[model samples]
Target: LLDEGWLAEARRVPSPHYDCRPDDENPSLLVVHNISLPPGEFGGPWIDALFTGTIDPNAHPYFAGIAHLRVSAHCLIRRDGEIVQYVPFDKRAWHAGVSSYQGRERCNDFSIGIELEGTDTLAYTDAQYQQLAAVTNALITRYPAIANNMTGHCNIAPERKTDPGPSFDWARFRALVTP
Candidate 1:
């Protein structure tokens, strides 16, 4: 169960990149994202390191470009369905990078970010779907404002980002959330 901004079932890894949200802000949107440490690779400590601000620039050719960005998400659903929490719901993670939702700008100010550890073109695992639905349900229960408001990174920042892309099955995800 999710209570007071934390998920009881998730493995918590506090992230320093997050800070307090705007005084009046509370989550009203759920943003789904696709993330693979080396862009397409999976199952590594790179994601954790990157989000926590310890990514090594020499670890990979791509790390040099983003190793300095202070970004994080509230939660991440790993390939095997493990859930890792970085920021608490009450605070704002630095995800969403210059984004908007429902014509409202700066989505990170009022949205909860959930990252799936995979590429946008890759098929997400069954475990990922199951856990994502469960967590999303719990989140909706805890924050009723976002019960029907969710979007992909691509949707919110189409010009700058494209994630949780064509491979994500919207029908299946919706069915699980509503079923």
Candidate 2:
């Protein structure tokens, strides 16, 4: 399911916005997040550009404000189920900024972040759920610490985030991910 830190079936994009984890141990947590470039729009290069530090301010009004920010996730599951791997699982991608999880600060230090290409209030596509479940299962298998440690970004950083939100069908996802 995985080749070292990279997912065997994912498309590697290799974002530069990541660093080595604090320790060489496998990631212990799985953080689910959602993103849509230009606020609520999907299916574009903007998300990739933003994560790769190549987003242009002129692309959109929203880009002007966030173009200067540095961020990335271990992987992103597109609306059509395409899997884009950015940072490797063993590295710390800058997805969780100023976040805490179970009293642990700096979630990115030990968690693998996965971004679903969507908004907080939109229903995710069937392909997305299927892909996410397969990915989650693979991650849990490769890094057993993440087996029962999955959580949404909103839960981990309630003060500044609310993604993979109410629209995400937790029960449905759990049914698919659970053994």
Candidate 3:
């Protein structure tokens, strides 16, 4: 079981750009995404920098203009399975731009965004899957309303997004988290 006090502390760090509630009242879904700075790049402080409002505009040409966009994920799992929490699960993180799932629109209103550090071309590490399963299980247990609501970014916004992409080990992930 999760320590409620610890979880509460985890949720208190305010994101530089996030605006939403900080409780389970609105957490009814889990939205999985995949990202790397510089489009397909990896292994740097760019992701953290982006979340903390410290990204250097010159880090990459792409970074030059996006510094003003407000975006964040509840949590991010790195390639090595390290987890970083940005926004609280109870709040609507800007990760899901314009999205929908099962006929419902604006998924960010009721979803927790989790970004896996990866690109479409490479398979996620075994450690990443393990960490993902544990995180998923913990979140599910922490927020009962999230039951039966876990899904991929693509599943929610098929026309515009593709993440937790082709390389994600869905079968293995399911096996690990199966009751």
lDDT of the candidates, in the order given: 0.90, 0.91, 0.77
Best by lDDT: 2
User: What are the C-alpha RMSDs, in order, of all predicted structures?
Assistant: 1.0, 0.9, 2.8
Candidate 1 structure, TM-score to reference: 0.97
Q: Could you tell me every candidate's TM-score relative to the true structure?
A: 0.97, 0.97, 0.87
* Candidate 2's TM-score: 0.97
Tens-digit lDDT track of model 1 for 84-179: 999888899989988777788998999999999998788999999999999899888878887779889999999798899988888888889945
What is the total number of backbone clashes in candidate 2? 0
**Candidate 2 ranges beyond 4 A from true positions:** none
Judged by whole-model lDDT over C-alpha atoms, candidate 1 comes out at 0.90
